[PDB]
Design a protein around this nucleic acid. Structure first.
Ligand SMILES: [Mg+2]
Ligand SMILES: [Mg+2]
Ligand SMILES: [Mg+2]
Ligand SMILES: [Mg+2]
Ligand SMILES: [Mg+2]
Ligand SMILES: [Mg+2]
Ligand SMILES: [Mg+2]
Ligand SMILES: [Mg+2]
Ligand SMILES: [Mg+2]
Ligand SMILES: [Mg+2]
Ligand SMILES: [Mg+2]
Ligand SMILES: [Mg+2]
Ligand SMILES: [Mg+2]
Ligand SMILES: [Mg+2]
Ligand SMILES: [Mg+2]
Ligand SMILES: [Mg+2]
Ligand SMILES: [Mg+2]
Ligand SMILES: [Mg+2]
Ligand SMILES: [Mg+2]
Ligand SMILES: [Mg+2]
Ligand SMILES: [Mg+2]
Ligand SMILES: [Mg+2]
Ligand SMILES: [Mg+2]
Ligand SMILES: [Mg+2]
Ligand SMILES: [Mg+2]
Ligand SMILES: [Mg+2]
Ligand SMILES: [Mg+2]
Ligand SMILES: [Mg+2]
Ligand SMILES: [Mg+2]
Ligand SMILES: [Mg+2]
Ligand SMILES: [Mg+2]
Ligand SMILES: [Mg+2]
Ligand SMILES: [Mg+2]
Ligand SMILES: [Mg+2]
Lengths: 46, 271, 93
RNA sequence: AGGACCGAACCGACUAAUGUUGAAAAAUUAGCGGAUGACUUGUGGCUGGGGGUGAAAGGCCAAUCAAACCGGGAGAUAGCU
RNA sequence: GCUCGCCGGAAGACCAAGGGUUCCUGUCCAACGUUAAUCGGGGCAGGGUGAGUCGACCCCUAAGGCGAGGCCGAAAGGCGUAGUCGAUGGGAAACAGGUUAAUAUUCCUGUACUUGGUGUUACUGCGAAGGGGGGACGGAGAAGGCUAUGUUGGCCGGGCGACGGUUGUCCCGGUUUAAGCGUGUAGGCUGGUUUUCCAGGCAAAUCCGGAAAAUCAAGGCUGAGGCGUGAUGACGAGGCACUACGGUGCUGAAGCAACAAAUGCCCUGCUUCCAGGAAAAGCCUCUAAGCAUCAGGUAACAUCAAAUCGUACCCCAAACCGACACAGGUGGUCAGGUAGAGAAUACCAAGGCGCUUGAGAGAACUCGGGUGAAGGAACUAGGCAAAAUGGUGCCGUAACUUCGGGAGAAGGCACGCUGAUAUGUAGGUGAGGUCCCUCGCGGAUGGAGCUGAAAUCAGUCGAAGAUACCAGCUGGCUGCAACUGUUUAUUAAAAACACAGCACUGUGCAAACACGAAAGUGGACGUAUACGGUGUGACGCCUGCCCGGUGCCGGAAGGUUAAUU
């Protein structure tokens, strides 16, 4: 039974990484909210 | 050329392969070869804008000279090549200056035949002249709609346009569709018809053959659900509606041309 | 070339184990803990100037820090760098 | 030669039993179908919610689908319990 | 430690992905481990990953992404040019042995190689962002030449048997060696060479393309493998001293040939087919500006540089994805023996395991199997399940048919072993020798040796010879769908969907149409033998009647009729 999560570091960073977040206004709002909440890990970045 | 295949298996019983042995069996001319990446009928937004387009065989686009602008220099047909991008067969021609160009091969322009373009060119199949210099009634192909723009009419296979009349600046042309269009006499047109007129006599014979050409299966609208197509579906095979497109527009009879910018050129519409 | 300031910082400390001693006695290789940013050319110059030994080749490996624990919280040791410096024939400590 | 034939890998999933607080939130076992093709597969890419994609089942779109998920309007409104 | 059993196209061995110290050592057993635990992928501590040549980075581009300006859009944005990123693809170079508890193409030993840089000398037309070539490419198929590899012999070392026999025609083991460099062979492609001359390759060009002569055709390119060297070496069965009893040192024989043989190599080949099969750089070459002492270039030579990052360990799994040490999922690489067509299957090798609760008993019942008197579908919704068929050769095979089929129809006979034919044949492989020879990776002949079906005849054993595993049940009539395909991931694989074919209809290109406040993009670098939509659904015979209604197409007199006035 193949499951939904298939780990791939390259794809993970290209979709949920820091640079992908900073590339769009919406993605920067994500980082701002996470910074406002106080998330230690702001992104899946490495 | 039309050759039926013996029924040695289901999928070969109905295949009617048109075989032309004059076609160069080697690789095509490399210097006039570019890349033809497939799109899957999708636009720059990634959305399927044209349905039933996907897969197929890889094709390298052969650059065909539809303008035929090298006037004065004769060319010699070297090989009648095969073009995977068009219904017709291209033809590599060598000019007397050492330049090779691909042209849509006319009906019987075999290797060795000499072709020439320009106003000084002779009235022969494969020679390109402006329609002002071509006699009225002469069958032509690769007709330009604008002078110097390149041919864009009767370029399929076995297609040609008869010059109905000449009325000074413009010339009446009977297109394959049956429409009479006025095109400027300055526009160039190649004498003769397009070759490979046996193209219509081929029979794919099987669903694989359609997929080889990059055509995906067409689902009928009546086989879908009301949310998927206007035809939707009922209990059983239910229709009871005027045939419409997947977007609601009437399909059987409704006209859709809406230009008003090109109507003047049109003399008679295809009956 | 490489300033003596740089050469006086690239070498952190001698490395003491069991493999290091075997190498120091058989392959004439002194294993030395070096700066993370110390390149092989930097390590060579430093060894020859602060130990007065002619060096042949320097092999560098980055040793990842083992993630230990304090009994209640997970902490990670910092990555260090190990340098296998092969002395041509010079003798040392 | 072949969307040819038999048949492992491989890709599927017709039947039976088992299992149904499972070994498993879809499997196991014995059989079964395709197996040079409209095949299958690795990596990356692309299409986004009345939107997509669909050889079309309202299928699929992260164990979620006659309108995903998350947050918000929000303490929606419940002559009902 | 000895038996035993299991896997062996795996349950072995390498990786990539992912994980992240799980690696190895010492130590501890509370918890974790479905039981105990002294043990562990657990706790704790310490140690372990060494590279110019492997990978990344790097140079180069694909799909695609972002995108100066730009175009467009209430805004946020969208698209896209010049560009610039982006591998799953292209681009320089290392192999054999040895070694640690834990890394090794990385350390060591031996022998190599690459690309830059600087310098010397000789010599010289050098020079892009341009031009050309090249890189550079499909499916299938059919060979032949080969190697990996196996087998056999020979050779060398050892052996002489717990129970009848076994100094031999016996038994066991070994019999291995690379990159590189040198040669240039089976095979593949190609005429060659010189000269003159021009609308082309934006300009230019000695390059490419073309055109024309001249003369010669044997030169070029490419290419497995082999042989030579590397290699006086390494490794090596196995011995001998000492033993932290694990070892440790040290020494070390043969190291050949024959045959068989890949799915690997020659082969990016070759033949054929239609569905017509990346790009870019490295690379080779050509010129455009200066300058012609320079600088650049070229060849040899000397010296210098090749950084950084990864390298443990798992990786079909107890380490990844599945909450679990979960009967699941997970791409690539290698591919031994016997039997076999085989990567099936059976049994083994190398290697790895016995699945982290056991001990008893031997009730019903459940599960998974074996057998069954007589009967033989009577069972049941239904032969569900089970049983049966099952290999090869050969004989033989109906209706119907689209002439392919049906068909493996149906049905039936032979099959083990042994001997002879023929102390192993036909076939294949081929040494020596002999001659030729432009004296070689050469040719002719010839056959040693090696391997080796099938068949026939005769005999012989069993109840049975395709003896296990493995391995169609068959026939008859009819519905639906032509067919291979596709689908409700996880109750529906079907008559549903698709399908070739057919038809109607739209559409003249700035096409219809589709996604887009738009720009723009697909359609399509297509052009009516085209594309879109719709219906039907191979093929054969065909497809009647109705336009009153609804829709569509056409026509507009006239009636009606908006904004406006
Ligand atoms: Mg319906
Ligand atoms: Mg129904
Ligand atoms: Mg009905
Ligand atoms: Mg229905
Ligand atoms: Mg810890
Ligand atoms: Mg079958
Ligand atoms: Mg199964
Ligand atoms: Mg079977
Ligand atoms: Mg993907
Ligand atoms: Mg919605
Ligand atoms: Mg919500
Ligand atoms: Mg409430
Ligand atoms: Mg331990
Ligand atoms: Mg780049
Ligand atoms: Mg073929
Ligand atoms: Mg005896
Ligand atoms: Mg020999
Ligand atoms: Mg193969
Ligand atoms: Mg390094
Ligand atoms: Mg590992
Ligand atoms: Mg387990
Ligand atoms: Mg598991
Ligand atoms: Mg399994
Ligand atoms: Mg097996
Ligand atoms: Mg067990
Ligand atoms: Mg019975
Ligand atoms: Mg049966
Ligand atoms: Mg019917
Ligand atoms: Mg069917
Ligand atoms: Mg289903
Ligand atoms: Mg099912
Ligand atoms: Mg139908
Ligand atoms: Mg039907
Ligand atoms: Mg009628």
């Amino acid at each position: 039974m193949k499951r939904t999560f298939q780990p791939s570091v390259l794809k993970r960073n290209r979709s949920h990484g820091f640079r992908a977040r900073m590339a769009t206004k919406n993605g920067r709002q994500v980082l701002a909210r996470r910074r406002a909440k106080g998330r230690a890990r702001l992104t899946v970045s490495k | 050329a039309v050759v039926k295949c013996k029924p040695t298996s289901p999928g070969r019983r109905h295949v009617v392969k048109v075989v032309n042995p004059e076609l160069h069996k080697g690789k095509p001319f490399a210097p006039l070869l570019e890349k033809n990446s497939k799109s899957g009928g999708r636009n720059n937004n990634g959305r399927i804008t044209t349905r039933h387009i996907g897969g197929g065989h890889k094709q390298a686009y052969r650059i065909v000279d539809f303008k035929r602008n090298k006037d004065g220099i004769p060319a010699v047909v070297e090989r009648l090549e095969y073009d995977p991008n068009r219904s017709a067969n291209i033809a590599l021609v060598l000019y007397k200056d050492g330049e090779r160009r691909y042209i849509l091969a006319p009906k019987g322009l075999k290797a060795g035949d000499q072709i020439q373009s320009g106003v000084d060119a002779a009235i022969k199949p494969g020679n390109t002249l402006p329609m002002r210099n071509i006699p009225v009634g002469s069958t032509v192909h690769n007709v330009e709609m604008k002078p110097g723009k390149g041919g864009q009419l009767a370029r399929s296979a076995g297609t040609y346009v008869q010059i109905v009349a000449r009325d000074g600046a413009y010339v009446t042309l009977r297109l394959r569709s049956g429409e009479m269009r006025k095109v400027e006499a300055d526009c160039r047109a190649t004498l003769g018809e397009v070759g490979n007129a046996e193209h219509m006599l081929r029979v794919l014979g099987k669903a694989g053959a359609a997929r080889w050409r990059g055509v995906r299966p067409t689902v009928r609208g009546t086989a879908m659900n009301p949310v998927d197509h206007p035809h939707g579906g009922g209990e059983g095979r239910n229709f009871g509606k005027h045939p419409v497109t997947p977007w609601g527009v009437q399909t059987k009879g409704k006209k859709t041309r809406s230009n008003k910018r090109t109507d003047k050129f049109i003399v008679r519409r295809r009956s | 070339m490489i300033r003596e300031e740089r050469l006086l910082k690239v070498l952190r400390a001698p490395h003491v184990s069991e493999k290091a001693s075997t190498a120091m006695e058989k392959s004439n290789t002194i294993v030395l803990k070096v700066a993370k940013d110390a390149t092989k050319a930097e390590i060579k110059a430093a060894v020859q100037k602060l130990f007065e030994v002619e060096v042949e080749v320097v092999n560098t490996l980055v040793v990842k820090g083992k993630v230990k624990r304090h009994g209640q919280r997970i902490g990670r040791r910092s990555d260090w760098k190990k340098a296998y410096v092969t002395l041509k024939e010079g003798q040392n400590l």
